[PDB]
Amino acid sequence: LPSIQLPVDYNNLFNEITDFLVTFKQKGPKYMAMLQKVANRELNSVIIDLDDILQYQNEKFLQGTQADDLVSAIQQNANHFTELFCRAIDNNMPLPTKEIDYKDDVLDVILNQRRLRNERMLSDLFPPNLTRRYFLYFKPLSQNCARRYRKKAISSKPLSVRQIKGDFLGQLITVRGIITRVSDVKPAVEVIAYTCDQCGYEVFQEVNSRTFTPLSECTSEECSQNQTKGQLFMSTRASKFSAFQECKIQELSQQVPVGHIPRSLNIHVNGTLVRSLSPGDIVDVTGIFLPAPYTGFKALKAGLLTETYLEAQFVRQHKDVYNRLAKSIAPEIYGNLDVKKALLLLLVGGVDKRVGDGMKIRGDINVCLMGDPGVAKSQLLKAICKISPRGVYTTGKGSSGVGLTAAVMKDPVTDEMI
């Protein structure tokens, strides 16, 4: 393992981050208040705005006490600064002010008993991630902030699945596309908790990969001094879980080069951002582009090719009354005033649908427009049919193969009538 001398210092960057969370002021410090809210169990998501980091950096430089460029460091390698920010928050966390319940806290009784036992044994602990109950997310650097302070924004600059190459791996980038598949929320384990039937001691194991190997024999100092072969058994009541969703994002029709087919990019959503993406939606998702190293024998036979994915961090969504509201059904069309009145009545769908002891009366005003070619029917039809929030323009034949009402077809692959 030959070593290189990279021009990055992590102690100085950690000190800068610690100072940032205790000095920034967009009321007391913004992030101190945000953390105070979390300690009261009122907030479960802290979002770090890189615009704030840029503002703090420029304020420090203006005073003459220039420091390292934290913003560029975060984007160039983002998977490492999540840990740094979490550690800083843990170190500078404030004590709660509002009385908490503390009644049904499994990982408070467990920890209290673990402290009591450890103190009694020593007189004669747990991984940091286990106690964390907040999620840290990064907000990209907005273009306005970058242009204000004479800098270029790489994270916010939208890209396409075509432009996401291997050079961008490990950075905070934005992707523009249409969601084409979403999965059900499932619990992805982060810290497994075991219990020894002999010691009464709990063993915590961190899992940070697609696969893990469960523990069998207790590793507690009690099972070591006595050399008892106690067996560890998994307990899902004390473990830590995070909501997990897997989605797919595809390129828009405006980004595919001629003669090429659209590509798809997998997206992983963890924490509270889950359920913010739905099928058939245009979004601007910012996340960390990371690989997924293989494990086991698959690693040897797979080769050097790496399967990658996106870790979502931020999501942005691309969003006489009678006579007057009648002559406005299709201002462009000229005549047919009474017809337009009738179409307005259709739009209102005027009814107070009545259901008594079972009888149902339809509440739909059907209308037909016969005549001869040339009179403005189709133009009227598409205008009236666009006006409504929901509409479907189709020919008398029907929507493609299936005709108007419905039809049962043999499944091409499963050969089941659907």
């Binding site: 160039q76 190293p293 797979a302 462009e332 189709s378």
Partner: protein
Amino acid sequence: AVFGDRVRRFQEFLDTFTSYRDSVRSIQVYNSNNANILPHRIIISLDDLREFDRSFWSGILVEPAYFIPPAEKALTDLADSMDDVPHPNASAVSSRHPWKLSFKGSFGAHALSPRTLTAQHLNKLVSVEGIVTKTSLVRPKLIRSVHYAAKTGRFHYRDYTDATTTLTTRIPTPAIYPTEDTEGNKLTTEYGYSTFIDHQRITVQEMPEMAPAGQLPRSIDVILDDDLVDKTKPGDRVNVVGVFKSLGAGGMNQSNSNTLIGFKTLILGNTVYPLARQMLTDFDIRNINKLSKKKDIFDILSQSLAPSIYGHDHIKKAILLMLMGGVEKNLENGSHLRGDINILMVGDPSTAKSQLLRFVLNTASLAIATTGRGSSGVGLTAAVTTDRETGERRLEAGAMVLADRGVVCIDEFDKMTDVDRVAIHEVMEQQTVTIAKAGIHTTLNARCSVIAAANPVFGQYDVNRDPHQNIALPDSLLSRFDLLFVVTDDINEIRDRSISEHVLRTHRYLPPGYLEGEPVRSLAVGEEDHVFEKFNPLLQAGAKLAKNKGNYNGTEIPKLVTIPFLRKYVQYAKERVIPQLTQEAINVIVKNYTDLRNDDPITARTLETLIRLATAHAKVRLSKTVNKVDAKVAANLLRFALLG
């Protein structure tokens, strides 16, 4: 020892020729200033290397595995020494970005084809020319991982290797990230400071013509990495230079039992040489303005297109008008007034319908000649498809969708099946296609123009019947076509002689180059007769009759324009002129429409045609306002298109 000697030799060679040093300096300066990114690559000519040193040239040509890496190292050392970057970045310091090499010039017997590649050419540099058929997805490949040890505060790194990444073989390195340091300290992978390169595998197929009679084509796989990742698409013709290699155990390992199959052979690509719009210069705009001012340009442009064809001048005029289209209006209510003309040709056999289609295809920026009779290949309209076994749903775009803001030249419109008729009706009426099948909901624009040809139902056009009777499509389909043209094959002795002689000329015309009439058989990739056309009796022919006004005796040589400049004219007009209707033209528009409707079924939609063609013609005159002349000429053209 030998490696150092070859590195020194290539350093001396690079020193001798300053062009490559200048190229490297230029690339480095451009990269530094732009801090869209120039790749680290240099193209050397094998002829220069042969002139400088024959031994190195022969070694590269016959033993690339032992002679190429030294050249790459020499170039990398030269670039690093020449580099003057004051402050690098963590990304740059740890990046594994050496300088690659590519070759041009003349090859000897190494210029082969996929069929001629045999086992005797392995471990040699070759140049393969063929057609791309497959193109795998672009994937990242790991070549270096950098880790951080918090306890010791030091950055470690490790390099990986694969058979498809290096010409010289080494022990495979499995893709397992180091987890603990040698001293035992735990490591954390730094993903942002690692190095990943792209990887793509393509298959090149022998050119069909070179294929021996009664033999299926042969194909060879090619591997491309880094910058040469997305440069080819299926169907393109390429000339790939690379090193032919053999990979894998090929059954030699005891695990396999076939004992007959051979090894797997591919090519490690070094470079790819490929085998729309013309950027207008300063004086080209002056030329186009000069032609525009001339108050006869409409005839010149109309008859420049398809100069060979005799007669049918009004069709040529209408085709140019269609090509330049009309302004498209988008009202605040979301209403979309169509602004693209459509033309349908119906006539007896042998009236150059296919010739007109070919000429519009050649002169049109976009076009797809998807015949209406079982359009195998690309369908007329979009239709989702699924795999036989995997059932991989996917929306396959048809011809109409693949012509957005362009043109689609359908052929044999009379052979369409009911499915195509129903699809086309909706496509033209709405200008957009919304797919709601197989759990797929999407909308795809289809704004374009349609030109089609349709033969009669009885094989010959009957004058006594209406055009809607000689064609057997419902009024819904025919109404969408703005202008309908009926053309008949008339027999005139002089016309017969002219057509006969013109067709005969080509047969006696020959492939000049070999004993006349006998068994018949790019230099670079990077990259006023010009405007007007000299008269040619062989090609133009009838174009002279056009200016003569149907007089064969007339010897008025016309002022025809070459197609390449006509394309520029249409491009400039379509991308810069947005005419606005004017009152002077509008009085005549209203009067003409009223006269048509009330006096010798004409429909209100014909009014749209008048305005559309008025704007289209105003675009020809290079004016931002539609004038009376444009309206009058459009009205006359419509009158001809309606009444003979």
